[PDB]
Amino acid sequence: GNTTSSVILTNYMDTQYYGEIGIGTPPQTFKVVFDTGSSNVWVPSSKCSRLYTACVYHKLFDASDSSSYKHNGTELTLRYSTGTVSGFLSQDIITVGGITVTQMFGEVTEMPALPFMLAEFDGVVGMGFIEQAIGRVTPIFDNIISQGVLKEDVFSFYYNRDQSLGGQIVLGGSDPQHYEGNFHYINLIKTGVWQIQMKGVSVGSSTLLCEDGCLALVDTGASYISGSTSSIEKLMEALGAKKRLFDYVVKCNEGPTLPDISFHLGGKEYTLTSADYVFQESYSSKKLCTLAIHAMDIPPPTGPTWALGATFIRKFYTEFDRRNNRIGFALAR
Ligand SMILES: c1coc(CNc2ncnc3sc4c(c23)CCCC4)c1
Ligand SMILES: *[C@@H]1O[C@H](CO)[C@@H](O)[C@H](O)[C@H]1NC(C)=O
């Protein structure tokens, strides 16, 4: 119990954060989202048809090039908020920074253009619990915990804004170069999902939303802070933001006039300024600027729930603690 492993992350557009893993012997490299909202590992397969355009423009795992590959073949479908993939289970050695682990993962053969033609990453490394794993496949972090190499049973996420480091995941600890001060932690409501109680969402000093408490999924594979359609409607109305065709917008010049939004988590107020939630692509009075807050109706049993995604994580460096089933936050830098 003396190792940490860091993976540097690419930040694409403040909406996708991904880093690399190896799969096989020798390692084949894939860009992957490290996603606390799910618990399966998958990458696209060389058995993916090239009529799926996503399988032309992403890297494919070729199992016949790996001496450590072991066949399974059980088919599985993974249904995300933004899209669905299906494929078959395989087993091989996965390299994550300085760590290797024998892992069962999906070889995805069905990869629809929506959303995977807008995914700059190849696949997904689920950082959630086995309870949310499709097929009850042991998640990669649980298998890494079994090795007893990690200094602590935690992992941490730094997501940068906007060259610079796009971000960083640390397995086994945290990186104090990327946060100020000390963590305050919020306990999970229950084991099996990275979800915590939230005791209020305030706009300025007035708690408009989640007044009787609500749920917050801390979701490293989500781009935005999200709430239900109803919640976000009220939030946007409070801000003066309007729904342009697909998204909520403000006049770019008016972004700096917008009030702070605070999330009441574990007896602390986690406050984002308008600079933290308005995509200020301009400050022009002649242009419209979108917000990094979207409606997302997450179905039961996980939802209805808020999701604290990359927008939140940018502001607050986040440690996911499996030893204690809690989530730590500190101010990112
Ligand atoms: C990191 C932070 O935000 C993101 C945003 N994530 C995505 N963006 C666009 N398409 C997809 S498909 C898919 C995901 C995703 C997340 C992982 C499960 C499956 C990554
Ligand atoms: C594939 O893995 C699953 C565990 O999720 C197991 O039930 C099944 O027996 C495995 N198949 C083979 C051929 O080992």
SS3 string, the chain, reads CCECEEEEEEEECCCEEEEEEEECCCCEEEEEEEECCCCCEEEEECCCCCCCHHHCCCCCECHHHCCCCEEEEEEEEEECCCCEEEEEEEEEEEEECCEEEEEEEEEEEECCHHHHCCCCCCEEEECCCHHHCHHHCCCHHHHHHHHCCECCCEEEEEECCCCCCCEEEEECCCCHHHEEEEEEEEECCCCCCCEEEECCEEECCEEEECCCCEEEEECCCCCCEEECHHHHHHHHHHHCCEEECCEEEEEHHHHHHCCCEEEEECCEEEEECHHHHECCCCCCCCCEEEECEEECCCCCCCCCCEEECHHHHHHEEEEEECCCCEEEEEEEC
Q: Give the C-alpha separation, 100 to 93, whole Å.
A: 6
Shared domain for 81 and 164, answered yes or no, is yes
Closest CA to 72 of 103, 44, 113: 103
Q: Give the C-alpha separation, 295 to 234, whole Å.
A: 11
137 touches ligand 2 (CB under 6 Å): yes
Structural domain span for residue 280? 175-332
89 touches ligand 2 (CB under 6 Å): yes
Q: Give the C-alpha separation, 298 to 54, whole Å.
A: 25
Shared domain for 14 and 154, answered yes or no, is yes
The residue from 154, 174, 194 where one domain ends is 174
- Residue with the smallest CA separation from ligand 1 atom 16 is 221
72 touches ligand 2 (CB under 6 Å): yes
Q: What was the structure determination method?
A: X-ray
Alpha-carbon separation of residue 220 from 152, 305, 307 (angstroms): 20, 15, 9
Shared domain for 119 and 184, answered yes or no, is no
| Residue 62 falls in the annotated catalytic set | no
Using the atom order of ligand 2, give the atom closest to the CA of residue 71: 13
Shared domain for 106 and 179, answered yes or no, is no
75 touches ligand 2 (CB under 6 Å): no
Question: Separation of 135 CA from ligand 2 center, angstroms?
Answer: 9
Q: What is the CATH number of the domain that holds 147?
A: 2.40.70.10
Shared domain for 68 and 124, answered yes or no, is yes
Shared domain for 165 and 96, answered yes or no, is yes
Shared domain for 82 and 144, answered yes or no, is yes
Shared domain for 160 and 196, answered yes or no, is no
Q: Which of 14, 35, 92, 153 is catalytic?
A: 35
The residue from 174, 193, 216 where one domain ends is 174
Using the atom order of ligand 1, give the atom closest to the CA of residue 17: 1
Residues in the chain: 333
25 touches ligand 2 (CB under 6 Å): no
Shared domain for 156 and 199, answered yes or no, is no
Q: How crowded is the C-beta side of 301, counted as CA atoms within 13 Å?
A: 5
232 touches ligand 2 (CB under 6 Å): no
| Residue 35 falls in the annotated catalytic set | yes
**In units of Å, what resolution does this entry have?**
2.3
Using the atom order of ligand 2, give the atom closest to the CA of residue 137: 5
Q: How far is CA 200 from its chain centroid?
A: 22
Question: Separation of 313 CA from ligand 1 center, angstroms?
Answer: 14
Ligand 2 pocket: which of 41, 69, 74 to mutate (most atoms <8 Å of CB)?
A: 74
Question: Separation of 15 CA from ligand 1 center, angstroms?
Answer: 8
Shared domain for 118 and 82, answered yes or no, is yes
Question: What's the total number of domains in the chain?
Answer: 2
Closest CA to 189 of 80, 319, 301: 301
Q: Which of 92, 153, 219, 321 is catalytic?
A: 219
Shared domain for 284 and 214, answered yes or no, is yes
Shared domain for 163 and 200, answered yes or no, is no
Q: Give the C-alpha separation, 162 to 13, whole Å.
A: 7
Amino acid at 328: G
The residue from 134, 149, 174 where one domain ends is 174
